[PDB]
Amino acid sequence: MKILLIGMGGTIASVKGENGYEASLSVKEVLDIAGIKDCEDCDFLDLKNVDSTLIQPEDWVDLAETLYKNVKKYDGIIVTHGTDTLAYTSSMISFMLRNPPIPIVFTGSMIPATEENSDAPLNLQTAIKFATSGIRGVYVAFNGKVMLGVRTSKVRTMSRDAFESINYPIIAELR
Amino acid sequence: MKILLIGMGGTIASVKGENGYEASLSVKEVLDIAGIKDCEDCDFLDLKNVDSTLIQPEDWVDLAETLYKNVKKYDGIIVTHGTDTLAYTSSMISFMLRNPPIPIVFTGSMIPATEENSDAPLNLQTAIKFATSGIRGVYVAFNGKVMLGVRTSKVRTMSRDAFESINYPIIAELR
Amino acid sequence: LVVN
Amino acid sequence: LVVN
Amino acid sequence: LVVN
Amino acid sequence: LVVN
Amino acid sequence: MAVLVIKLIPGLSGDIFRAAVELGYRGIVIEGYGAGGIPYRGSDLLQTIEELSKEIPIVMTTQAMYDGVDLTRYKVGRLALRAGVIPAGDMTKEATVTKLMWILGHTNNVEEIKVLMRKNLVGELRD
Amino acid sequence: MAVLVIKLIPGLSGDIFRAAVELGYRGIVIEGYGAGGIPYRGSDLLQTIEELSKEIPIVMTTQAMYDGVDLTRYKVGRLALRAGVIPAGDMTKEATVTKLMWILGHTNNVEEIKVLMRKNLVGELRD
Ligand SMILES: N[C@@H](CC(=O)O)C(=O)O
Ligand SMILES: N[C@@H](CC(=O)O)C(=O)O
Ligand SMILES: [Cl-]
Ligand SMILES: [Cl-]
Ligand SMILES: [Cl-]
Ligand SMILES: [Cl-]
């Protein structure tokens, strides 16, 4: 029912400017541009707006605190993030927040939502479908697949199917 | 026609003794135990007998020198090796010996040839089939697949299908 | 601070 | 969306 | 043994 | 040194 | 806090690990070959680790994508266990690193850290 | 000769690279994220590399299994190029390391080493 989306940045929320400088969108704008319409009664917090290569440990603290503040209020949380360090973030968060009462789903995209063939809509559709599932825990949603956050790794640098559940069954996938 | 097999050790040539100490077989014994029968007019050199974790750069020098000495004499060379650093060896050899006139094929196994369900026969059958191919270059043969040596990586630690050609088409496979 |  |  |  |  | 991740390659000298400890790194992750182990033929690696593994935790993961580490499978592995190395089981590289950093935030006792790293906290490990 | 391979993780301090160079490592490989780049927000990494990348070659590979590195794709990447980092293209981690060690055996000139690392010698690279 009530779903909070937290922005962290990443390609998902990008629109490279007319010279060579990446610029960032708010998470709310990202959803509108992706074209997610079912998502009503959805709140939006913007926490960072960086390329995830820039992610430092302190960011995990900010993010966990934010999350801890919001678990009792929301039924599912989604966090948009750069793919580069997504699995680091997802894993670390999994240790800080040992027993989440709600699904906390990380996602992102390789092609920015603004672009024509972006993987953003699918990833977000996926993330939202699962955020409503009632499945407690920290997850990653990518390329129509949901993975335990603490078993996910980036395996491809230039493909939509960038992630894999390693040594552990995929939790769910649209197949 | 004339094929030289060089032993470097590895699980392939193992038979753990009755207490917890790995012992090693000669490459020639390994073939007999695997059960390779077609291989006649095949010579056998034993160069090392170590677990490949122990492999140091100096070993690449010994091995390249040996190889350089034997390319003009043989039509194909096969090198049995531990899987742990096989891809390091295969790659480094590829740089030292820039233009081999013959196929030089690395192989090994995850299950020792002495064991009942060993992958050794297949790997060796594969290595030998390809050593006769007339395809110049340095390769790796594993799980019925032949890969460019300089594009091969160990991807699994506890499976027969331990290797993959990365970012590059498989050269050949028994399929 | 949240947008609805 | 499918689990197994 | 098969190439492609 | 080689075995045949 | 600070953890250093080093990929095990041939000819790797244990002197860098010494420097790491000096610098005040509080944990070290060695990304090794296959099921796991430390080179002892022609390197001071295993020796150096024997020393440091009691000051800071030293964790062994694998370079290979799948199946993870098992130091009991081979002798180079079993030696590393004896040397005080903490195995990473079937954890992802990222779950291993972050688990380590997390545990470090809570303790500095290498034996505790070892018990913790071997315990399945959230689904990261098959113990 | 001696090459050090370090996995890029968050909070990674460029001080270890300094120590490496001191120790006499003649090449450094950084296994970074995705398509490539060096952190500059809240770390001295990029700065430190700007310094060292002219003394020893500093090579960027990726932690990800497939597709390899492209420093031109993102700004963190493009910065690393400017910083003097040598990209590893689509090479395997093992082909990268061994190619580096091999080139090092032949020269110590970082510009030569850079031209070489970018040249497809035997099929290791798509250049
Ligand atoms: N460089 C981007 C990669 C992506 O989002 O696909 C990031 O991780 O922030
Ligand atoms: N530990 C063995 C692994 C194998 O051969 O399968 C080695 O690489 O020598
Ligand atoms: Cl893409
Ligand atoms: Cl096996
Ligand atoms: Cl430090
Ligand atoms: Cl040294």
Domain boundaries, chain A: 1-175
Q: Around H85, how many Cα atoms within 13 Å sit in the side-chain half-sphere?
A: 32
Residue G21 CA to residue G16 CA, distance in Å, equals: 9
User: How far apart (Å, rounded) are the C-alpha atoms in residues A26 and H73?
Assistant: 22
Helices (H), G1-127: 15-23, 45-52, 75-82, 93-104, 110-117
Q: Are the beta carbons of A100 and A136 closer than 8 angstroms?
A: yes
Please give the C-alpha separations between residue A49 and each of A83, H46, H75, in angstroms, as whole numbers.
13, 20, 14
Distance G76 CA to ligand 6 centre (A): 22
Task: Quote the tokens at residue H86.
Answer: 């040598």
Q: Which of B150, B152, B164, B170 to mutate to test the interface with H (most CBs of H within 10 A)?
A: B150
Compute the nearest-CA separation of A92 from chain G (Å).
5
Under a CB-based contact definition with an 8 Å cutoff, are residues A146 and A171 in contact?
A: yes
Resolution in A: 2.6
Structure obtained using:
X-ray
Q: Which of G6, G13, G65 sits opposite H6 (nearest CB)?
A: G6
Three-state secondary-structure class, residue H78: helix
**What 3-state class would DSSP assign to F4?**
coil
Q: Indicate whether residue H33 lines ligand 1 (CB < 6 A).
A: no
| Alpha helices (H) along chain H | 15-23, 45-52, 75-82, 93-104, 110-117
* Residues A82, A109: Cα–Cα separation, whole Å: 7
Half-sphere exposure of B14 (CA within 13 A, CB side): 28
Q: What are B107's strand-pairing partners?
A: B80
Strand A152-154 and strand A163-165: the pairing is antiparallel
Q: Nearest C-alpha of chain A: how many angstroms from G31?
A: 15
Q: What pairing do the DSSP bridges indicate for beta strands B172-173 and B145-148?
A: antiparallel
Nearest ligand for residue G3 CA = 5
Q: What is the DSSP letter of C4?
A: -
Distance CA B4, CA A94 (A): 53
H14/A118 Cα distance (integer angstroms): 35
Q: Supply the angle between the helices B120-131 and B27-34 in degrees, to the nearest 10.
A: 110
Which residue type occupies H91? M
Task: Tell which residue, G39, G126, G24, G120, has the closest CA to residue G83.
Answer: G39
Write the burial class of residue H90 (CB in 10 Å: 0-12 exposed, 13-18 middle, 19+ buried).
buried
* Contact between G31 and H7 (Cβ < 8 Å): yes
Orientation angle between helical segments A120-131 and A27-34, nearest 10 degrees: 110
* Beta strand pairing call for A145-148 and H27-32: unpaired
Asked if residue A157 lies in contact with residue H66, where contact means CB atoms within 8 angstroms, the answer is: yes
Cα distance between residue B80 and residue B150, in whole Å:
17
What are the structure tokens assigned to H25, written together?
Answer: 């490592």
User: What is the rounded distance in angstroms from the CA atom of residue A155 to the CA atom of residue B155?
Assistant: 12
Q: How many CB atoms lie within 10 A of CB B30?
A: 27
**What residues of B are in contact with residue E2 (Cβ under 8 Å)?**
172-175
User: What distance in Å separates the CA atoms of residue G126 and residue G90, rounded to the nearest whole number?
Assistant: 6
CA atoms of B134 and H38, how far apart (whole Å): 45
Residue B105 — φ and ψ, nearest 5°?
-110, 120
CA distance G110 to G104: 9
Give the total residue count for chain D: 4
Distance G35 CA to ligand 2 centre (A): 9
Q: Which residues have a Cβ under 8 Å from the Cβ of G37 and sit 6 or more positions away?
A: B51, B53, B84, G71, G74, G75, G76, G77, G78, G79, G80
User: Can you state the angle between helices G15-23 and G45-52, rounded to 10 degrees?
Assistant: 30
Atom of ligand 1 nearest to the CA of A85: 8
Place of tokens 């060993």: B118
Rg (CA), chain C: 4
Amino acid at C4: N
Query: What are the CA-CA distances from residue G26 to residues B108, G2, H8 (Å)?
Result: 38, 6, 17
A59 and A87 Cβ atoms separated by less than 8 Å: no
Third-level CATH fold of A1-175:
Rossmann fold (3.40.50)
Q: Which residues pair with G98 in a beta bridge?
A: none
B126 CB within 6 A, ligand 2: no
Nearest to A107 by CA among A84, A74, A81: A81
Looking at the CA of residue H33, tell me the nearest atom of ligand 1.
Answer: 8
How far does Cα H46 stand from its chain's mean position?
12
Q: Which amino acid is at A115?
A: E
Chains H and C touch (3+ CB pairs under 8 A): no
Angle at G109 between CA G108 and CA G113, to 5 degrees: 90
H109: CB partners within 8 A, 6+ apart: none
Arch. (CATH architecture) of H1-127: 3-Layer(aba) Sandwich (3.40)
Decide: helix, strand or coil at residue A4: strand
Alpha carbon distance G30, G59 (integer Å): 6
